[PDB]
Design a protein that fits this description.
Largest sheet of chain D: none
Number of helices of chain D: 3
Structural class of chain C: alpha+beta
Biased composition (Basic and acidic residues) (chain D): 59-70
Strand content of chain C: 15-25%
Subunit structure (chain D): Part of the 30S ribosomal subunit. In stalled ribosomes contacts ribosome rescue factor SmrB.
Largest interface: D-E, 23 and 21 residues
Order of helices and strands of chain C: EHEHEEEEEHEEH
Helix content of chain D: 55-70%
Largest sheet of chain C: 3 strands, antiparallel
InterPro entries (chain D): Ribosomal_bS21 (IPR001911), Ribosomal_bS21_CS (IPR018278), Ribosomal_bS21_sf (IPR038380)
Chains: A mainly alpha (67), B mainly alpha (151), C alpha+beta (150), D mainly alpha (70), E alpha/beta (117)
Oligomer: part of a larger assembly
Distance between the termini of chain C: 42 Å
Bound molecules: magnesium ion
Pfam families (chain D): Ribosomal_S21 (PF01165)
GO molecular function, one term (chain D): structural constituent of ribosome
Chain lengths: 67, 151, 150, 70, 117
RNA sequence: AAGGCGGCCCCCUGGACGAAGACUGACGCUCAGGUGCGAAAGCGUGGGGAGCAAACAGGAUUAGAUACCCUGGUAGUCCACGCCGUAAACGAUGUCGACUUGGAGGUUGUGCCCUUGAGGCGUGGCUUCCGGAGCUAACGCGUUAAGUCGACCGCCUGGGGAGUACGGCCGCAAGGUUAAAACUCAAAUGAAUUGACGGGGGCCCGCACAAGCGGUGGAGCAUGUGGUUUAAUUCGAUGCAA
């Protein structure tokens, strides 16, 4: 059910990658729900953790403004 | 009113001139079904104010009527003691009728020599935007902007 | 202000439309207690007989027993001070088998006691329920309108 | 949330883009639920009721197509 | 006194009132208006027309500073989230940003209990 | 296992499932006493306390409002060690075994096929919805049975009195646990059916409102009703429908 991974076989989303990871967050720094992304239950679940790690490491913003 | 969308009944052809607006005005003015007396009075006031103004009779009546035909009124579709008032723009069909009703209401307010003289002054000053109908219209128009929170 | 004991339970029980500010005729201890001494207006009605609409229902706490020669009682039929112009309405629309006249409040005016009286019908539980229903429903409708408007 | 007007943009479309961005982000819908406190008991109740209704409406709509030709 | 070229408008709309204020660049406010201070009070002041009038009154009290651009920051849920913007645009301003700032907690402090009206 | 558990990271650890492989050889299920865990509220000690909030203060509606609403606000909610062991602790369904038609899914493994797309064919674990036979007073359950059985434990025998008092135990306390008797009653009950009602929802009609017009209530005039007075003011009609 990993629509964005069927032809790639990544099998593990890494928080280091941002180029193919910023497509799963909207302009306001919110994760696009799997209901819309069409992502597998495990792949979306680990991608959320990867995005959280990136936010902790200041790779992705928490909010749009983030003053 | 609920399921029927009525049309409109034809008005008198106005034998003197041929103005359906004049027919509507005389029908509003007349009371108790006494058409003869009301028509005579309105014709006499018709002549007096036309000869007082100087211009053409109907061409002056139309310009005096369009100057106190209102544009937006205030209504209240609320139930209970508390009420909210909403402005509604009048359609052209009801605009002339409301203007004529205001004119005839303001006519019976002066102690002149006769009803024709009562009509004449308040009919002629409408062209110059004076009298009682114009006075109430310039406040009805202000009522719309008095509280225009909901429209 | 000058307001003294008023009956609001009767005001709730009735929907009075009549308001007469007629006065009252009293003895000494009556006005003594009315100035200070708790004259009670609860359970008040008139007793129109001849031209003598006594306020039958009215209690009072006596100031003292100074008037020892004659023994008085709080339960006295206090008379009424009303114009003959309006006394005809009481001569008339009081005998309707369902109409009464009751006292609402009692106050002072230039050291004279005036007891307000009014003509009422009487509410039975099934219309008090409707009155409370409407009272709460107006509030609920206004609240719903405000919530919808946001 | 952050909507900067591009070069030579009408005010109407500039405000419309802001409104659409706010609607997509769901800002007005978050305050309406964070204004008051909702206990976990009623939160789970509402979630279960919403899921049941969403399931039932879809089932009824799909099952009503194979009946009542017109 | 001073003359600023461009500023930042702030909106603090709610379900009862609307506050529009003007800042120069950094945090120094140089003009503000409210819906309750424009004649409207109680239920009427929560209407978007009150917010629109307050925005006009605030824009008419900033002429001394002579600003021309307004980086608007909309905050608070209320009818004044668009009427104030319309009034500011009609008052002759060239807005540069339409930023929306909202204090949405991340499941932080407990909100007050629900009203059992 | 239940209660319950939601940023991220680290340290220790319990539990569940599957591909293939060998042994241990009935070691297997349940359980009166007993022990342990056990929502929140509550109590003791030592801290912490931003927001919320019992008690409490003020305002407001109401005949009254010791409430619902508004403005503040203490215990509490938080941390560590301690105490009670109460819940609609609910799937109102005690644990295990096998047998008894299907469809649509959810999550998580595994074998093979040209894996050109979340292509297909099988097989397991958990769980959701619909439903056949069967069961039930009905609602409903329906391979995760409330279908037919087997092994074990607990409980029920009319509604009140009452899970109340006494009595034994636990507990600093609040209280928990085991648990009656006298007296009264002809019922107390649950699933469903037809009406009626809802300050429940949806749709529709009528001068019922909205846009008019004219009147009534104001002051005599012609009538009937109520009470008044008299010997009678003869009797009936007493909401809309007098
Ligand atoms: Mg509040
Ligand atoms: Mg483990
Ligand atoms: Mg045991
Ligand atoms: Mg606790
Ligand atoms: Mg508080
Ligand atoms: Mg409070
Ligand atoms: Mg404590
Ligand atoms: Mg129990
Ligand atoms: Mg149970
Ligand atoms: Mg066991
Ligand atoms: Mg499980
Ligand atoms: Mg079923
Ligand atoms: Mg006990
Ligand atoms: Mg109601």
């Amino acid at each position: 059910k990993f629509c964005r991974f069927t032809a790639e076989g990544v099998q593990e989303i890494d928080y280091k990658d941002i180029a193919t990871l910023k497509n799963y967050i909207t302009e306001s720094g919110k994760i696009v729900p799997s209901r819309i992304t069409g992502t597998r239950a495990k792949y979306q679940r680990q991608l959320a953790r990867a995005i959280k790690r990136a936010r902790y490491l200041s790779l992705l913003p928490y909010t749009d403004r983030h003053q | 009113p609920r399921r029927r969308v009525i049309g409109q009944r034809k008005i008198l052809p106005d034998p003197k001139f041929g103005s359906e607006l004049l027919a509507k005005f005389v029908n509003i003015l007349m009371v108790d079904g006494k058409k003869s007396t009301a028509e005579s009075i309105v014709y006499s006031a018709l002549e007096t104010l036309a000869q007082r103004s100087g211009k053409s009779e109907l061409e002056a009546f139309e310009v005096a009527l369009e100057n106190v035909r209102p544009t937006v009124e205030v209504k209240s579709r609320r139930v209970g003691g508390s009420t909210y008032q909403v402005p509604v723009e009048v359609r052209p069909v009801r605009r002339n009728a409301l203007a004529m009703r205001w004119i005839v209401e303001a006519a019976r307010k002066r102690g002149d020599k006769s009803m024709a003289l009562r009509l004449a002054n308040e009919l002629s000053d409408a062209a110059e935007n004076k009298g009682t109908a114009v006075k109430k219209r310039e406040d009805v128009h202000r009522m719309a902007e008095a509280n225009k929170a909901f429209a | 202000s000058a307001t003294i004991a008023l009956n609001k339970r009767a005001r709730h029980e009735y929907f009075i439309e009549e308001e007469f500010e007629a006065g009252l005729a009293l003895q000494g201890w009556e006005v003594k207690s009315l100035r200070a001494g708790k004259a009670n207006i609860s359970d008040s009605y008139v007793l129109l007989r001849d031209g003598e609409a006594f306020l039958f229902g009215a209690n009072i706490t006596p100031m003292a027993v100074a008037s020892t020669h004659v023994v008085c009682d709080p339960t006295r039929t206090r008379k009424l001070l009303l114009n003959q112009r309006e006394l005809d309405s009481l001569y008339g629309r009081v005998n309707r088998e369902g109409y009464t006249v009751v006292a609402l409040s009692l106050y002072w005016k230039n050291a004279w006691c005036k007891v307000k009286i009014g003509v009422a019908k009487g509410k039975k539980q099934h219309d008090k329920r409707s009155d409370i229903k409407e009272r709460e429903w107006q509030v609920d409708k206004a609240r719903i309108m405000k919530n919808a408007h946001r | 949330p952050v909507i900067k007007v591009r070069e030579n943009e009408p005010f109407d479309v500039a405000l419309r883009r802001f409104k659409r961005s706010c609607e997509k982000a769901g800002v007005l819908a978050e305050v309406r639920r964070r204004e008051f406190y909702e206990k976990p008991t009623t939160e789970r109740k509402r979630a279960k009721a919403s899921a049941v209704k969403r399931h039932a409406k879809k089932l009824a709509r799909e099952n009503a197509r194979r009946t009542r030709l017109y | 006194r001073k003359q600023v070229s461009d500023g930042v408008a702030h909106i603090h709309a709610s379900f009862n009132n609307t506050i529009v204020t003007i800042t120069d660049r950094q945090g120094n406010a140089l003009g503000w208006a409210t819906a309750g201070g424009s004649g409207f009070r109680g239920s009427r002041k929560s209407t978007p027309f009150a917010a629109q009038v307050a925005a006009e009154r605030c824009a008419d009290a900033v002429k001394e500073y002579g600003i021309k651009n307004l980086e608007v920051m909309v905050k608070g849920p209320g009818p004044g989230r668009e009427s104030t913007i319309r009034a500011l645009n009609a008052a002759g301003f060239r807005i540069t940003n339409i930023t929306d700032v909202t204090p949405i907690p991340h499941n932080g402090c407990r909100p007050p209990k629900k009203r059992r009206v």
